[PDB]
Write a protein that binds this ligand. Structure first.
Ligand SMILES: [Ca+2]
Lengths: 627, 43, 42
């Protein structure tokens, strides 16, 4: 590149546009980012440079054994638009810098892609979309090295987007939020939050600016500074919302209080608690073989409106893409299972001969429904990480269950074989093998049913030997006395292993996993906070029992910012200014590092040595001449 | 004491060394030019 | 036939077959111990 610098810096020689374009094409084809930077920086008009034939040639320069070439020929001029649309999805798939950036991302030219990003216009959305695209392509790379390179470049682009938004937000919160919530035309009119959700950029959600924006959207039209007690007080007595307790602007006031996501969340929590109370009241008292009463019909209508709401938020959650995204959430699976169990229980009950089966199904369905209340504490800032840490402990739980099952089988079968009770019915065998040793882990040790010194000695059994009568109801009629000391020793070893070793080991594993995964679980909570807020943003303002009204309107009719062209161009210019400032600061910080100082010092010492040698030779020549 | 401890850090030593090498380069260039001029004059 | 010997010859398939056989062996052992084991000839 030094030769190019020397040639192009000459003032006597000027270079016409033809040579510049030829050299630019050569450098773009041959992957020389420094040359393309030099040529473009020397007054080159890139807009007139690019032609459809030039882009076709650039895409034809793809390697023969490359994923981009494979997909381009599978789609069949380069019809890369179809390739993009089949990669990302119709929701978020796509100075011609955007085209060059897309080409470099497709061909995995890391420095070319970074340089094009540094010269782009919509920098934050381009970084998020590039991270999404690189992750998607890494999902399709057969070579592990290609997948690793794509994931590394995706992480680099995510870091660039996070840093740029951090720079922008510290300038003005209003314009940064406007940039974050706008729709980018290049990436299918998807907002930066949608792209960050699609790309699983959890580090983008975890920063302070995005979290503050999410908190602002969570409180709706009232001030985020509003405390919880004031909100609850205003909720319970609606006419009190008009006083100075709640600060707004951040009949109209009524719709601004009852339309906030947090108010809808609280209304749904209250309605769910009342639904559980009604369910328990019906289950414990009202449920009778007689035809359903008023409370049963009210419960059925409540469950019907719950099902309608689940259907609505599954449809509104590509139809197949929306269905997959709705089913991908565990809290929605917990709703679907509960509703299916409710339907099965009611259907069984309505049959005259299946009343008890229906009641049992509904009794289990009550547990299924009540488990859903755990979603309430995913909104807390302190206990939000805890619930997502807890979900990581299932490996330890299942390890403990497997070890416990093996040990219970061994100990129970050995003890049952030693005792030889005469009531050897299969349910009794299973009970004395599994249920009793399991209860011995929780302080329920039936010594009178196992230790022969505590029993009565009688010759009930006709078989030869000695036998004793345990007073237990399901402990067998009589047991053998041959090796009772071994039964006692087996009990001692069981208490030593199960009550101490396994439980202490499980505690150790829980502590280890907690300390290992707390850091990632915090970020996961911060990422899923957006899904929570966007779920409650579009919900109807009514509670489920009355929500059939809102759904009716939604049947009667069968996160966005609108910007004019001038406002959009001003926002993009501001973003580009901040990107240039950030890049210059990063480059300056790199240049002032100790390694760079040492390198420059070494180069200057070499230059001094060359000058010293030249002076030495010239002094020798002068001395020779003057003598 | 704090200022002295900061001045004796490796980063400051490297910075001062770079500045002194630049000064040496300037003096070497001056001596080069003066030697060329002296050789021209004496010939 | 080659596909048959390629499925039943894999190490993981042999591992699963041995796991199933060991579980059945333990079940038979427990059945013999708790019920069948009597002073009469086996
Ligand atoms: Ca739901």
């Amino acid at each position: 590149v030094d030769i190019a610098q020397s040639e192009l810096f000459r003032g006597d020689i000027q270079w016409r546009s033809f040579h510049l374009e030829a050299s630019l094409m050569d450098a773009l084809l041959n992957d020389r980012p420094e040359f393309v930077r030099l040529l473009i920086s020397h007054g080159l008009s890139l807009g007139h440079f690019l032609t459809p034939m030039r882009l076709a040639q650039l895409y034809s320069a793809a390697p023969s054994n490359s994923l981009i070439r494979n997909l381009l020929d599978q789609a069949s001029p380069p019809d890369v638009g179809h390739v993009l649309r089949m990669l990302l999805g119709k929701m978020c798939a796509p100075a011609p810098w955007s085209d060059l950036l897309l080409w470099a991302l497709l061909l995995n030219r890391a420095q070319m892609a970074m340089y094009f990003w540094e010269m782009g216009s919509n920098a934050v959305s381009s970084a998020l979309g590039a991270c999404l695209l690189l992750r998607v392509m890494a999902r399709l790379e057969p070579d592990a090295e290609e997948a690793a390179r794509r994931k590394d470049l995706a992480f680099k682009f995510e870091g660039m987007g996070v840093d740029l938004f951090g720079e922008c937000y510290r300038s003005s919160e209003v314009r940064a939020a406007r940039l974050l919530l706008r729709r980018c035309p290049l990436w299918g009119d998807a907002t930066c939050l949608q792209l960050a959700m699609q790309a699983d950029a959890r580090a983008f959600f975890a920063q302070d600016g995005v979290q503050s924006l999410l908190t602002q959207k969570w409180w709706g039209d009232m001030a985020s500074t509003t405390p919880i007690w004031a909100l609850v007080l205003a909720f319970f007595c609606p006419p009190l919302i008009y006083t100075r307790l709640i600060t707004f602007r951040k009949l109209r006031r009524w719709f601004h209080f009852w339309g906030a996501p947090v108010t809808i969340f609280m209304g749904n929590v209250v309605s769910y608690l009342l639904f559980l109370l009604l369910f328990s009241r019906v289950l414990l008292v009202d449920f009778q073989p007689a035809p359903p009463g008023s409370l049963e019909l009210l419960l059925y209508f409540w469950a019907f409106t719950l099902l309608c709401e689940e259907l609505r938020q599954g449809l509104s959650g590509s139809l197949s893409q929306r269905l997959r995204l709705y089913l991908a959430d565990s809290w929605n699976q917990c709703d679907l299972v509960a509703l299916t169990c409710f339907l099965l229980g009611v259907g069984c009950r309505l049959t005259p001969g299946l009343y008890h089966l229906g009641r049992t199904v509904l009794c289990i369905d009550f547990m299924v429904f009540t488990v859903r209340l755990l979603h309430i504490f995913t909104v807390n800032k302190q206990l939000g990480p805890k619930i997502v840490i807890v979900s990581k402990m299932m490996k330890d739980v299942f390890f403990f269950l497997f070890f416990l099952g093996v040990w219970l089988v061994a100990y129970g079968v050995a003890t049952e074989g030693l005792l030889r009770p005469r009531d050897s019915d299969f349910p009794s065998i299973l009970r004395r093998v599994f249920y009793r040793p399991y209860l011995q882990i929780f302080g329920q040790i039936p010594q009178e049913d196992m230790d022969v010194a505590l029993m009565e000695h009688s010759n009930c059994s006709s078989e030869p030997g000695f036998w004793a009568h345990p007073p237990g109801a399901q402990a067998g009629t009589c047991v053998s006395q041959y090796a009772n000391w071994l039964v006692v020793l087996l009990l001692v070893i069981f208490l030593l292993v199960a009550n101490i070793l396994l439980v202490n080991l499980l505690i150790a594993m829980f502590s280890y996993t907690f300390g290992k995964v707390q850091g990632n679980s915090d970020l996961y909570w911060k990422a899923q906070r957006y899904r929570l807020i966007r779920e409650f943003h579009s919900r109807p303002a009514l509670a489920p029992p009355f929500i059939v009204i809102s759904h009716l309107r939604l049947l009667l009719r069968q996160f966005r910012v609108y910007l004019s062209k001038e406002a959009e161009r001003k926002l993009l210019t501001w973003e580009s200014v901040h990107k240039e400032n950030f890049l210059l600061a990063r480059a300056r910080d790199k240049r002032e590092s100790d390694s760079e100082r040492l390198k420059r010092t070494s180069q200057k010492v070499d230059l001094a040595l060359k000058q010293l040698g030249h002076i030495r030779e010239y002094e020798q020549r002068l001395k020779v001449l003057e003598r």
